[PDB]
Point group: D2
Chain length 434, copies 4
């Protein structure tokens, strides 16, 4: 009576990409039905063959949807009907859309997450592979967007690599809980025909099966975990984009991007988009009583969008990180003797000069250059040697940026030895994540 | 003025022994510090301290304290160290301990549900779909569905504690530690599993905070769902069960649990926005992490225990649960009856539909229909069809894994017990 | 490569901005003529072409079918006009139109609730607190409570519509229109109420989008609550009413969908520097989805309210004597007994009752006086649900006089908000 | 014990002590008029309430572990000051219509304080825009120098966004200024209490239209949060602009030692956007799904509001100071201005000569290409170098390479031209005042 409601439950529009997983679900169920005694070796063949046909149709868009197809489910159950005959009805025996729609989603997500996984590690591998050939480049490090202290351009690219490797790790943990068979849970209390679930697992290639039908029917944990996985990933990409946006300014002049688009902006904007899907599903799920509820239908559109977003955005990021051109001279140009004010105290420290008792001489020399109109390195022992009995003719080495970075040899530091170690550590993480 | 203190002291003791191995300190100094710090941990576990107001972060409350206990020697304690890698070290140690507290309570809740399902394994009540009676299920199938979702929260918690259990200390301000400090020693002292791979990341990253909140948010969703169910079942209308009174006030205990969901979610949304737009490396913004962490930790700890209490002390009304079962609900089982006799899917329900009508037409339920009546709808109906109109039998059709048959339930209980054991 | 360009392909979902786009162009064209950048003839040219387009990204689409229709003359149309102020003019014009539609749907829902409250004013059922029977209330009081909340959404709707009804066209890329274009003429042509104050603000702000979404989410909150109530009252256990599917679940599920949009835009905006940034392109999809969601949901809600069937029988059956315990206490309060003395006197009547295994309305006058000699024989007027509800005459209460008065304050509000 | 600790609210709802007392005084008065209280009783209760009012003011009031919430604490207090008589105060009242009456009184007052601070910030922006009206700096798009603009056109774009926030604040305050008291538990007040009298005493504009709604809704809380969040988006954006601008790289400005503790103050402001957004999200999820009427879930409103009220109140004053005491560098903002940025103005030059928009830029770009292959800038090309591309190029073309003239092209309302900037200041000046 209400053309509004009908359209509201109309999903065939965006849901069709599940055509394949919906088909492989029926084939699997059919086979189990024959063993369950509901289907004969003969009927099964007729059914599989019909399902194989419709399958090959989509692979060529040849398929044709009618104006009566509510969703991908019926669209096939229909074509299958008008193909092998009324013997098409035996296939839906004992099954429900409740465990059929969740089977479809995890299969789809398990497939999609493999795609994403590939692109993600490719990105990490680009950052890492770039941090290896530009390991000598040095530029400013920031704290509240203010030149802090000297660091290697490579320590920068790897910091994003490390954050991203953790996303790959979370992805894997999410993929494992998704790789569990929900089919066979029926509409609520389970499958009433003593169907062979282990067989379904095998055919559908899941790693294991759902423990409780009610939970397997109502939980969307796998959707939320995924969205939260995707969201944290986006936070990382927007952080990277933010720095690249800043460095690519005229004012910074640190680097330039390829192309002939505004790609970095896109990457940053998608974090909100993705975040919106997380918030959406969490509120849809909050307050719902057991077991199955119409509300759970909002999961699809969210999964689809984030799936395509991460896929397009990851590849774009790889491109950027592989074609952007840095300016070693401008990154060096940015370095200043002021930044060496930190190491300055460190000189006294090794000489035995205690903490604060060493950081005092640091500021003194500064306000003094702010007095003699020079940079802390232009001074001399005909002075500094006064600010502290500790300034042999070797303190001169302190005013060298390469030596500055080389101080951080400890694990995780910016020294070339610490970086190289990181890169080897990252090749290990990847060689394992696979 | 409380929590981050004890881990802070431990953070200094470890960096001290390590500062001593770097040459910055001597056995004398090390002893006078590692004895004064221990002297401070000694006070808090009593109730002495709290002073002035120039001391911003608890760090200074402690740092500026040393000058008293010993003197200007304490200054060296921060040699090479930064407040940036020092604050994250405090947080991870805090969360590591908290996660342990929480895990204990979580597993207790799960066991409370598992243990209760085993004892009431015979009780039967209606299962719901869009809140309408759909079909008979065992009360234990209900309890176990929650317990299952909760074991996944435990798995997530474990995955989160793992990445939190990594030493960030030694990263300094952003480029690393300048004195070639021995981070391996720090790890051993503080007892982390491994050490951070990159200084800049370890300083700025707040992945560990997001994950924890994301873990806490899904746990609360699960908790708000159980609460919703019990609130509904505890209404007069349903009359399925009542709360012990200690958790009542009006099942306040349930409303509380459910309301905490948004509270916790707000924190997740909060930290995600603080991080969203931010260039590397450290930024003052990251300070908003602590209050968010502290709040979710106390909420989870309290909420989990209230939940355990409710589940173990609520009284079910087996009577009303069984009086809720109607013949109406066995219409599908009737169609299933024929299906096991070769009757096709469509015709099966078709026939069953007539049944409901033949009785819908008269003044009796489908279980009062005689063999004569059913036969006028399908010669496949035998006198044994009467075994359909038995709720015990209804539930016993689901023998396939995950189903509500008695055997499947006992299988689940055994699997969950393994799961809990695994959770250690 | 189609992996990055694909993302900027804002054409498959915003073709609905075709009409509003052409109007901005017609209007800008006229202004561009008075500015002298276009000859009187060059005007009829770059306008008769737009004439056909409407008769049949979206910008390029029209900015393409235009040149290939009137020749190269159409090129002078972009003179002094940036996409930044053109895209913002499109959304604002589009949202205004969508808000009038939405307002009409919202008004219909409110009117169906009020109208239903008028006719079913004699129905009484349990009022809940923590989903536990609290005090007897009129079914109409329940309906007017949702209607009242919805009237606040309509009020919020107008407040947002006002700030949206401001002309953004003419702000240029960011510093403004360089050709001293007559914005008053642009305003009148396009029908805005006034024009933007600062060009930078007009190019980069998306307040109007955040405001719309905040209005939409709160509105969805109100709708998900009404639905939740109707989901519970329609359960077999409650049996208060039946709907003439899963419409209720459908309405409730849309709250999160809309909340998601609010959350995403807020996150997209946070931390962006001035002035314009590509990121802002995410506003469209979110606005389109929420406009369709509200348009459909509101109408589905209206249907539900007018066609659901209540059960006067079950609703009254649900009224138990225990719900009148407070009324019992209030019986003494009106006699003169202090607050505490009465409520405890009522507490012992409920005790003395459960003891004997009866309901409080069955206690004999004798048994009551052993609890308080203040219980005259008139105490029987208390165990009456119409009398219970009729105690609440004070404005806003559930007494019949208050309900009728509410229906009138609302009847005037609907009139106001329109 | 855990349950009791988690169910308790006394610990934080203490701030409502005064508004709670004020609420009771009003009710007490209407309760006396209703006949539930005698003239003497009223005076005793009133005097008692006044005494309790001071105990909190002087910070004397003592809390008992038995105090479950601020409402109970005060009730107990009157009891020990006037005895049994104090118990008759709650007659016909509920913690349901009482708690919301309290929250609304608190928010009306807190909103007045926020309004003051918001307007002062806007005033600070406008006053500075008037004075530094000649300063010119680059305008940005995707953080790439686009076209020149006046520093004031920049300051005002922020002032304008903030005026809309002040407008939204006024709208929220209106719906909050409604009396919820007398709604009871959910069915209304049974004693026929005079609510009109209540509105008058507590100074509300109007009264609750429906009992059930008045006790279950938190619109007023969500609106305030939506108001707060959008306001923080504006402050986070300005903070982000000032952060970039204060970098050594840009060097357009620097903060005074007072705030820039590293522009710390700016980062402190930006961070709060998420903190305020979080509260918005929580309450929205807390209400979603909640059935009619009152539910314990609604208790989460208070801590959310307190956090956002104290946050905005601190952040608004920090922002005002930052804008007031910051030091710009006219020299740098001026150097940032480059000839390349005028390439477009050069294109419009021809446009103002009957030259088609098409051949206009096609002729403009070539001017950038010509000087592109000479290692100079467009302002250095010879008059002959120009006429070559388009004889339309007169001798006055020179003037185009002047930044002041660049900004003065935008005379149309809203632009960055000076006449436009002064008009804006007058409009915003008027917007405020009409505002209040
Ligand atoms: N009084 C009451 N609860 C109130 C709470 C105030 C509070 N601590 C808050 O923050 O909301 N509800 C009654 C309603 C009735 O009897 O109708 C009940 O317990 O059932």
């Amino acid at each position: 009576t209400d053309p509004i409601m009908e359209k509201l439950n109309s999903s065939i529009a965006y849901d069709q990409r599940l055509s394949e997983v919906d088909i492989q679900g029926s084939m699997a169920y059919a086979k189990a039905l024959e063993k369950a005694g509901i289907l004969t070796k003969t009927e099964l063949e007729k059914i599989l063959s019909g399902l194989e046909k419709i399958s090959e149709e989509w692979s060529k868009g040849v398929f044709v949807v009618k104006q009566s197809d509510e969703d991908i489910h019926t669209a096939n159950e229909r074509r299958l009907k008008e193909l092998i005959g009324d013997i098409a009805g035996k296939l839906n025996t004992g099954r429900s859309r409740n465990d059929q729609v969740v089977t479809d989603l995890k299969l789809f997500m398990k497939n999609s997450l493999s795609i994403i996984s590939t692109h993600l590690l490719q990105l990490i591998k680009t950052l890492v592979e770039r941090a290896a050939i530009e390991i000598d480049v040095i530029l400013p490090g920031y704290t509240n967007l203010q030149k802090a202290q000297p660091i290697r351009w490579s320590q920068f690219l790897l910091s994003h690599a490390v954050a991203l490797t953790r996303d790959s790790e979370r992805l894997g943990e999410v993929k494992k809980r998704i790789n569990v068979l929900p089919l066979g849970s029926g509409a609520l209390a389970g499958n009433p025909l003593d169907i062979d679930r282990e067989m379904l697992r095998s055919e559908l290639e899941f790693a294991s099966i759902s423990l409780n039908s009610m939970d397997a029917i109502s939980e969307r944990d796998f959707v939320v975990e995924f969205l939260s996985f995707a969201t944290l990933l986006m936070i990382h990409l927007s952080k990277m984009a933010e720095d690249l946006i800043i460095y690519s300014t005229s004012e910074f002049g640190f680097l330039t991007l390829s192309d002939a688009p505004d790609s970095l902006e896109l990457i940053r904007s998608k974090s909100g988009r993705v975040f919106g899907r997380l918030a959406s599903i969490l509120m849809v799920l909050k307050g719902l009583p057991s077991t199955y509820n119409k509300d759970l239908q909002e999961d699809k559109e969210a999964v689809f969008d984030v799936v395509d977003t991460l896929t397009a955005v990851l590849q774009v990021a790889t491109g950027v990180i592989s074609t952007l051109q840095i300016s070693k001279e401008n990154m060096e140009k940015a370095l200043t003797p002021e930044m060496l004010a930190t190491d300055l105290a460190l000189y006294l420290v090794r000489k035995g000069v205690p903490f604060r008792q060493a950081h005092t001489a640091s500021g003194k020399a500064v306000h003094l250059a702010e007095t003699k109109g020079i940079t802390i390195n232009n001074l001399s022992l005909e002075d500094l040697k006064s600010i502290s009995p500790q300034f042999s003719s070797d303190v001169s080495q302190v005013f060298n940026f390469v030596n500055s970075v080389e101080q951080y040899t400890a694990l995780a530091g910016t020294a070339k030895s610490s970086v190289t170690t990181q890169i080897e550590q990252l090749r290990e993480l990847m060689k394992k994540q696979k």
